[PDB]
Structures are given as C-alpha cells and as structure tokens.
Paper text:
The taurine transporter (TauT, SLC6A6) plays a vital role in taurine absorption and distribution, facilitating its transport across cell membranes. TauT belongs to solute carrier family 6 (SLC6), which comprises 12 transmembrane helices connected by extracellular and intracellular loops (ELs and ILs). Both the N-terminus and C-terminus are located on the cytoplasmic side, adopting a pseudo-symmetric topology characteristic of SLC proteins, with an inverted pseudo-twofold symmetry between TM1–TM5 and TM6–TM105. TM1 and TM6 both exhibit partial unwinding in the middle, which, together with TM3 and TM8, contributes to the formation of the substrate-binding pocket.
We employed cryo-EM single-particle reconstruction to determine the structure of TauT in complex with taurine (TauTTAU), β-alanine (TauTBAL), and in a substrate-free state (TauTAPO), achieving the resolutions of 2.8 Å, 3.2 Å, and 2.9 Å, respectively. The taurine molecule is located within a negatively charged central pocket formed by TM1a, TM1b, TM6a, TM6b, TM3, and TM8. Moreover, TM1b, TM6a, TM8, and TM10 obstruct access from the extracellular environment, resulting in an occluded conformation. Specifically, the main chain of residue G62 and the side chains of residues N63, Y138, S301, and S402 form hydrogen bonds with the sulfonic acid group of taurine. We replaced E406 with threonine (TauTE406T) to disrupt this crucial electrostatic interaction.
Author numbering: 38 to 181, 189 to 587
The structure:
Amino acid sequence: PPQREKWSSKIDFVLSVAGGFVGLGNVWRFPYLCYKNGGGAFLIPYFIFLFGSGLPVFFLEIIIGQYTSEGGITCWEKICPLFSGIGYASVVIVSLLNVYYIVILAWATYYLFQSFQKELPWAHCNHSWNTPHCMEDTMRKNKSTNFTSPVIEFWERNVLSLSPGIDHPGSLKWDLALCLLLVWLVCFFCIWKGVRSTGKVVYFTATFPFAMLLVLLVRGLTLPGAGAGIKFYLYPDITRLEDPQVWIDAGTQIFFSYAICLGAMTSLGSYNKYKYNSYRDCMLLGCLNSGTSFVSGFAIFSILGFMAQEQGVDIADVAESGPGLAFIAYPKAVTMMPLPTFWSILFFIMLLLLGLDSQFVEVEGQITSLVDLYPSFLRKGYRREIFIAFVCSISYLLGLTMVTEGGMYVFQLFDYYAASGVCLLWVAFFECFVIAWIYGGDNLYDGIEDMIGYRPGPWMKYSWAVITPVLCVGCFIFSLVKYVPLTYNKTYVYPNWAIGLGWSLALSSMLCVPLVIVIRLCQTEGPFLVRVKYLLTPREPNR
Ligand SMILES: CC(C)CCC[C@@H](C)[C@H]1CC[C@H]2[C@@H]3CC=C4C[C@@H](OC(=O)CCC(=O)O)CC[C@]4(C)[C@H]3CC[C@]12C
Ligand SMILES: CC(C)CCC[C@@H](C)[C@H]1CC[C@H]2[C@@H]3CC=C4C[C@@H](O)CC[C@]4(C)[C@H]3CC[C@]12C
Ligand SMILES: CC(C)CCC[C@@H](C)[C@H]1CC[C@H]2[C@@H]3CC=C4C[C@@H](O)CC[C@]4(C)[C@H]3CC[C@]12C
Ligand SMILES: CC(C)CCC[C@@H](C)[C@H]1CC[C@H]2[C@@H]3CC=C4C[C@@H](O)CC[C@]4(C)[C@H]3CC[C@]12C
Ligand SMILES: CCCCCCCCCCCCCCCC
Ligand SMILES: CCCCCCCCCCCCCCCC
Ligand SMILES: CCCCCCCCCCCCCCCC
Ligand SMILES: CCCCCCCCCCCCCCCC
Ligand SMILES: CCCCCCCCCCCCCCCC
Ligand SMILES: [Cl-]
Ligand code: NA
C-alpha cells in the first residue's frame, strides 16, 4: 500500500460525487415518502434536518477521508481506535442496501422492454390481466363498485402479481429474474473492466436526466388541475407534526439521499489532494441534490393533481402511497404527450442511467473498503475479480427473494428497516459524538484550516457538538415512546415474525459498535483505565 491514487483532476471528483449521491433517491423515494405523510408537513422536518445535520455530516465524512487518506473502514483507526466499529456498521449497511437497491432497476428494465410495442400496455383496459372493475380514466367522471385504473391494474397484476401477504411467497417470476440477472451482469462488467471518464460519454450521461426532468416538469405544469396538486404539495398541516413518523421519515430521507453513514463519501474523499478546497464544492453539490429533489416534487404532484381532478376523487386516494407512486404517475404523464412510446423509452432510459451510476459507486466503495483490510491477499495472492464475482453472485441470490409473487412485502421491509431509520441515526450520532467530544472540534478545525487554507465558521462545529446528537436522540426516543407498526399501502398488517426479522435487519449493523469495543478492551493488557486511555488516543491521524 504505497499511496492511494489521487484524482486526475477536480472535475473527476465532482462528477463522481454527483453521479454517486444523485439518483433514484431523488426521483423515486422522496415523492412517495412525501405523499405517504400527507405533503407539506413533510417539508418542515426535511429542511430542519437538511440545515442541521445533512450538509455538516457529509462535509465531515469527506474531510475525514481527505485528512486520513484512508477508506471508510480504516480511517477510524487513526481517529479513535476504540470506536472502530463504525466502519463495520457502515459496511454492513451498504451490503444490505446493495441487495435491494437494484430491484427498482429490474422493474425499470421490465418497463423499458415492454415499451417497445405499437401501443402502450398500460393505456387501456382490455387485456388478459385486467379485471371487470377496470374502467377508462376518461369515463370515470361521466358515470357513477370500486373501479380501478388501467395503470394501477397493470402495475399490480402484470409486473408485480401481488400475493395476499408476505406468508404467501407464491412462485418465482422468471421474467423479472432475467432482468435482475441482466442488470447485475451489466454492473459486474462495468466494475471489473473499470468504466473510465470518457469525455463524451459522461458529458451526455450527466446531462440527459436533467433535460428529461425539465421536459417532464414542463409537461406536468400545464395539465388541468396542477394548482390543486401544488397546493397539496406545499401548504403544511401542523396537526401531522405531533407524530414521530413524519419526523423520522423526513430525517432519515436526508441521510439516505446524501449517502452518508455508508463509507462511500470517505472513500471518495480519500482520493483528494491534501491542499484542496473541498468545502465550496460540497456546498454546491448539496445545493444541486436538494434542488433536484424539490423540482421533481413539483412535477410529480402536478401530475397527481391532474389525475385526481380527472378521475373525480381526492389527491390522497389516486396512487399507491408506497414504492410504486413513480411507476403509477409518470407513465400516465407520458401517455398524454405526442408520440408516447418515444417519451416512455426516453424516461425509462433516464431512470436506468440515474440508478446505474449510484449502484456502481456504492458497490465500488464497498469493494475498496473490504479490500483494504487485507491489501496483500486480495490484490495478488487471491484474485480481486473472483472476489467481485462472488459478491455479485451472493447479492443476486439474496435479491431473488424480492422477485417472487410476494416480494413487494419483503422489499418494503428492507426499505423501512435496512439502510434507513434507527441504524442511520445510530451511526450518525456516534460519528458526530466521537468527533466532537473525543477528538476535538477545534483540533479538527486546525487540520481543516491547514488543508483548505482558511478557517471555517462555527456552524459545522455547533452542528457536530449539539444539534445533530440532540436531533438523533430525540427522534429515536420519540419513535420508541409512541410506537406504530409498519404497514404496506396503509392497509396490510405484517405478522409479528416479520417485524422481528426487520428489527434483526436493523440490529445487524447497530450491534457492531459495542462488540468491537468489547473485543478491543479484551485484547489489551493492563488496568482498565490504562486500557481505556490507550484506545482513545488517535494513532497519528496523518496531517
Ligand atoms: C436549497 C439549499 C440546497 C441551498 C443551501 C446551500 C448553501 C448553504 C450554500 C450555497 C453556496 C455556499 C457557499 C458558497 C461559497 C462559499 C465561499 C467559500 O469561501 C471561499 O471560497 C474562499 C476562497 C479562498 O480564500 O481561497 C466558503 C464556503 C461558502 C460560504 C459556501 C457555504 C454554503 C453556501 C452558502
Ligand atoms: C445468501 C443465499 C445463498 C441464500 C439462498 C438464496 C437462494 C438459494 C434462495 C433464496 C430464496 C429462494 C427461493 C424462494 C422462493 C421460491 C419459490 C418456489 O416456488 C421455487 C423456489 C424459490 C425460487 C426459492 C429457490 C431458492 C432461493 C432463490
Ligand atoms: C468562513 C466561512 C467558511 C463561513 C461560512 C458560513 C456559512 C457556511 C454558514 C454560516 C451561518 C450559516 C447559516 C445560519 C443560519 C441559517 C438559517 C437557516 O434557516 C438556513 C441555514 C442558514 C442560512 C445557515 C446556512 C449556512 C451558513 C451561512
Ligand atoms: C481488529 C478487530 C477489532 C477485528 C475483529 C472483527 C470483529 C470485531 C467485527 C468485524 C465485522 C463484525 C461482524 C459483521 C457482521 C455481523 C453479522 C451480524 O449478524 C452479527 C454481528 C456480526 C457478526 C459483526 C460482529 C463483529 C465483527 C465480527
Ligand atoms: C421550515 C424550514 C425550517 C428550516 C430550519 C433550519 C434550521 C437550521 C439551524 C442551523 C443553525 C446554524 C447556525 C450557524 C451560525 C454561524
Ligand atoms: C447482515 C449481513 C450483511 C453482510 C455482511 C457484512 C460483513 C462484512 C465483513 C465483516 C468483516 C470480516 C472480517 C473480520 C476480520 C477483520
Ligand atoms: C411460507 C412461509 C414463509 C416463507 C418465507 C417468506 C419470507 C421470505 C423472505 C424473508 C427471509 C429472507 C430475508 C433476508 C435474510 C438475510
Ligand atoms: C449480503 C452480503 C453480501 C456481500 C458479502 C461480503 C462479505 C464477503 C466475504 C468476506 C470478505 C472479507 C474476508 C476475507 C477473508 C479472506
Ligand atoms: C420529544 C419527546 C422526548 C424526547 C426528548 C429527548 C431529549 C433530547 C435531548 C437529549 C440530550 C442529547 C444527548 C447528547 C447531546 C450532547
Ligand atoms: Cl432528497
Ligand atoms: Na446516480
């Protein structure tokens, strides 16, 4: 391990970060979490968390990676050897996230392959998967039995084929399994070979999604009924703020969308030069991420308002209110533009491009963090390609559980418990507490001043010292005191063993800190206080 290879230029670092932390979490997860919580009231805790913990923790991870010049699992050895379980917890969280983050891309691939016909299959109600209820959206207001929309019927009876419950796995769907295999093969081939920053390819891969988003926003804003959707999206409801669910959802959506507590930002920052101003760039990238999410919300809620006006029902009873809101709302939008197939193909290509870069960055970060533990064995003595192939195969086999007829429930369980929620709060709280109260805020500020050239303000120091731990602990305690079980589409109730499995998924990463603390204490010689003093001393964080 001579030295980590630095970036060729700052543009490479900026492009890598932008492609890694802007993606499906901005256009797929934000809208449905906002819709589930009623909209409007979701934006107050969202912005509170964004300006209290979101940017400061992201900058802290980047600056720690740059300072220590080490990955996301070994940097904590040079800051606080006792609290070295944070890296292991992050690697567990990223391993669990990589398994279920790709089923969305499998669904997108299915939709893209299905959009190559003369007429879109989700536009009408005369097919083998339709039910006697299916009625055209144009005729819903004209007449009147619980009618169903062709888009929802398609999504629920052709792509998913939903089962009565999680205890009814049904049979494996081979068409979705083939799409999952295809996307996993593409991901594996784009990592073993190592996709380079081709000037033309990236120039297009990083500009097409924003153009498509602008086109969708312009189309949505001119539909009849967009004003009601915008008012539903913007105006808040103070009564909803008395529940911990909205607070925890909005708080952890920021953590999910900024890719923190994952070990990926530390790895990305480890390739920076020592004398590099990585503060302004981080602020601008956070601005870009938040703006992208906020802009996409306008378009999706305008489409929802138009659909609600057309069908003649409320805006809260038009879509899934779960991980299918985008797949219900955006195809309905593209069915109204001229040449619907062209725009459908373009939209799904944009979705795939947004997802694939994030998946690439996360898997690369996980691999490079797990390799640094044994840099001798897994570099020459054993093949790195074989290790990558084994990881991909195991992840695909594990993700096969969400492809069966009853896999939506497993996907929802994974989304709620793994790589989101209490585990993210736990990791963020421990990172901030360690840095602020064991290493030293001013001690880190000296290194930041040495690296970037100027001393920052007290905002980051205060956020690390007080604001973030208080928010995390308060949200955790508020959620625990008033407990409400998880549901799917506000109607399905999970069995007890499913909740136990979800809590085990959450605890698999949360249990890594005390175990590592105990093992480190047991591996040291001498009196207890001497051992504690020896393991709280930073082992020369390279300055
Ligand atoms: C809607 C949301 C997402 C917007 C929130 C982001 C803001 C908090 C950003 C916008 C631009 C950022 C600023 C852009 C420029 C600078 C100047 C920079 O100082 C220098 O570049 C000095 C250069 C030198 O001396 O070499 C310090 C960071 C700062 C204040 C950034 C701090 C945070 C700011 C205000
Ligand atoms: C970590 C890995 C090794 C765990 C094992 C993954 C594989 C071997 C497991 C996980 C879930 C399993 C599937 C779950 C449900 C069904 C439906 C049944 O009608 C055919 C078998 C099938 C398709 C199982 C086959 C094997 C399976 C895919
Ligand atoms: C010396 C340089 C680096 C100092 C940089 C100061 C910047 C990074 C800090 C200092 C004070 C901070 C602001 C303090 C108060 C608010 C009000 C809140 O509603 C939005 C966030 C906002 C606007 C903060 C955002 C960023 C901020 C302007
Ligand atoms: C130098 C020392 C600290 C390295 C020793 C590694 C130990 C402390 C770490 C490395 C990764 C960690 C494991 C990662 C994954 C799991 C699976 C989970 O189901 C139980 C906890 C468990 C088993 C963790 C326990 C502690 C663990 C084994
Ligand atoms: C409804 C939106 C509310 C947004 C509230 C954001 C609160 C952020 C507090 C940050 C305080 C930083 C002080 C820095 C002073 C130098
Ligand atoms: C819940 C399972 C998630 C996936 C498993 C992640 C574990 C990663 C490896 C842990 C460290 C192994 C080496 C220990 C000796 C240094
Ligand atoms: C017919 C009885 C139930 C059969 C199993 C249904 C649930 C299967 C998914 C949950 C187990 C795997 C989760 C991931 C574990 C790492
Ligand atoms: C759901 C987890 C999938 C990925 C599994 C990652 C762990 C792979 C095996 C452990 C590698 C590190 C130890 C190697 C010892 C020679
Ligand atoms: C909202 C219902 C009660 C929850 C409030 C819990 C107290 C929050 C502050 C606790 C102190 C933070 C611990 C570490 C900060 C230095
Ligand atoms: Cl977001
Ligand atoms: Na991306």
